[PDB]
Design a protein around this ligand. Structure first.
Ligand SMILES: [Mg+2]
Ligand SMILES: [Mg+2]
Ligand SMILES: [Zn+2]
Lengths: 64, 75, 189, 102
RNA sequence: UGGCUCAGCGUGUGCCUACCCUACGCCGGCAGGCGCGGGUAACCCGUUGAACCCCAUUCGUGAUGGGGAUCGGGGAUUGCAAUUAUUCCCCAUGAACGAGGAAUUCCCAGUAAGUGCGGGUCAUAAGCUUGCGUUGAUUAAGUCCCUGCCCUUUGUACACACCGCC
């Protein structure tokens, strides 16, 4: 009925966004399904290869 | 929440409360017993040093501002 | 093994989530006798990450004017508080702290610039580094605000702030402001 | 000054040109004056293809496209930033901009 | 409240031009006073024993032992001259003020901030200023959103140049 929290790992950094830099856009893949890979915008400092919490599957997806 | 007006010195109804339930819980400081028994806090330091001479309460820290005590091992 | 403050060997603690497994610094590599080091961690991005989190909490515990340089008072109150949580729970104070860090780290937030519905407009999830940074600040502020006009001290105020965060009872200001954030982020999806 | 010998339109031998409404602002424009777009978009997203191919009940089910013809007055065209001002010399060439294929 | 225990800048006796920085001993409760010197200075002040902090005491969430505003009395130095109080000390009253609206300043590591110490101003002197020192973080390694700047393109009826013109 509801989607529980899962984890996804950043693989590549796309660039800045939010017209201030407080949000960085990155490309992630899900450790649950490696073939499942989306693009997510995050806040705070992020490097390549780290993993971050996710409370929902798909919110936003676009290209700069 | 206008004043605390805690008793500066004990009476009969709080002297026995200090000596029957205060040395029963681990987290004991002059601060914590002040919000439990509604005592001033300078008196609490005097009472705690009384209970250390009576030997029913162990010491842990003994600092000029953060002096802490504890209960002896149970069982 | 390092016996921080003479006790509480750091080899026993753990981080329950892998997003934070490499973003907490109580590992045996970051096992230090004392939480005081002029190690110049913040001279570069992605370098405060390897700074021991106990050092980071110590730095973040001094705020609001009269206490910005005073670090010896901070390390000592940290030491008093860690024995307090070890006494009140019976287990490792670093495990009390680590549970507080994980449970108080806001998993998501929201930030926009234009006209907003209530506060923010679009929901953007935070980084694990931001998760640790915000959890440390929120725990520090909860202790700071709890010790302003009450007879209780910093060490005990920090104790209940860490404890209510570690277990979770909506008494910690570190989780209460976390959930207040999660509500706005979810509602502004 | 006569900015263009083109006079901003293709009307050379024609006396009158029928008008076409703008898509965005809904305004009559002369037909050869208006810049005409012919978008052939993916009927799905770029990232949605992976999810659609799983749900598709045909194995080699080709992806449909989106054949739309767009009409823009130069006011809406500049606002959409589909056309841009060029220098006095750069205004002369009529070749389409590069397609960004590779 | 008592004990512990640490700095670096930098300065000192005068052409005019009178006026140095002070060790030590004695008197006074203190502010100060009286003699014995030293230094024209890495030679004396000065191992510049500063403040913060460190460790213990009392205070105990009250407009309180926070706060020292206002004001009274008294005593000392400087100067011909202290009233409109030069300054300091002592005894007294103890005001507002319980973290500050709209708005807004500075800042990316020895930074901010706490914190005292030199120099200048000086017969008398700092809440200023210029420098020095002790303690030492948070977030950030980005953007052109608000505020501006630089290059190119463009339109202008602007050229005192958009605070323009009309
Ligand atoms: Mg024209
Ligand atoms: Mg005609
Ligand atoms: Zn249009």
């Amino acid at each position: 009925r509801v989607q529980p929290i899962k984890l996804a790992r950043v693989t590549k950094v796309l660039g800045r966004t939010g017209s201030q830099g407080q949000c960085t856009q990155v490309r992630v893949e899900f450790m649950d399904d490696t073939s499942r890979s989306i693009i997510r915008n995050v806040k705070g400092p992020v490097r390549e290869g780290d993993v971050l919490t996710l409370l929902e599957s798909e919110r936003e997806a676009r290209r700069l | 929440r206008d004043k605390l007006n805690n008793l500066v010195l004990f009476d009969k109804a709080t002297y026995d409360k200090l000596c029957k339930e205060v040395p029963n819980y681990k987290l004991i400081t002059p601060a914590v017993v002040s919000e439990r028994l509604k005592i001033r806090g300078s008196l609490a330091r005097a009472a705690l040093q009384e209970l250390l001479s009576k030997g029913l309460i162990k010491l842990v820290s003994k600092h000029r501002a953060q002096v802490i005590y504890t209960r002896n091992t149970k069982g | 093994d390092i016996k921080l403050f003479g006790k509480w060997s750091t080899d026993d603690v753990q981080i329950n989530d892998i997003s934070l497994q490499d973003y907490i610094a109580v590992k045996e590599k970051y096992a230090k006798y004392l939480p005081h080091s002029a190690g110049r961690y913040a001279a570069k991005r992605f370098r405060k990450a390897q700074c021991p989190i106990v050092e980071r909490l110590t730095n973040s515990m001094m705020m609001h004017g009269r206490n910005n340089g005073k670090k010896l008072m901070t390390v000592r109150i940290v030491k008093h508080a860690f024995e307090i949580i070890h006494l009140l729970t019976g287990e490792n104070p670093l495990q009390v702290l680590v549970n507080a860090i994980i449970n108080s780290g806001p998993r998501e937030d929201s930030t926009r610039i234009g006209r907003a519905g209530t506060v923010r407009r679009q929901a953007v999830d935070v980084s694990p580094l931001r998760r640790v940074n915000q959890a440390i600040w929120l725990l520090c502020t909860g202790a700071r605000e709890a010790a302003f006009r009450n007879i209780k001290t910093i060490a005990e105020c920090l104790a209940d702030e860490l404890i209510n965060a570690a277990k979770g009872s909506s008494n910690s200001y570190a989780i209460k402001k976390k959930d207040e954030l999660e509500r706005v982020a979810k509602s502004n999806r | 000054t006569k900015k263009r010998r083109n006079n901003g339109r293709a009307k050379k031998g024609r006396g009158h040109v029928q008008p076409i409404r703008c898509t965005n602002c809904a305004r009559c424009v002369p037909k050869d004056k208006a810049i005409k777009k012919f978008v052939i978009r993916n009927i799905v997203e770029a990232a949605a293809v992976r999810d659609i191919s799983e749900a598709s009940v045909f194995d080699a089910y080709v992806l449909p496209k989106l054949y739309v013809k767009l009409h823009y007055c130069v006011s809406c065209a500049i606002h959409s930033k589909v056309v841009r001002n060029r220098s006095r010399e750069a205004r002369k060439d009529r070749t389409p901009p590069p397609r960004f294929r590779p």
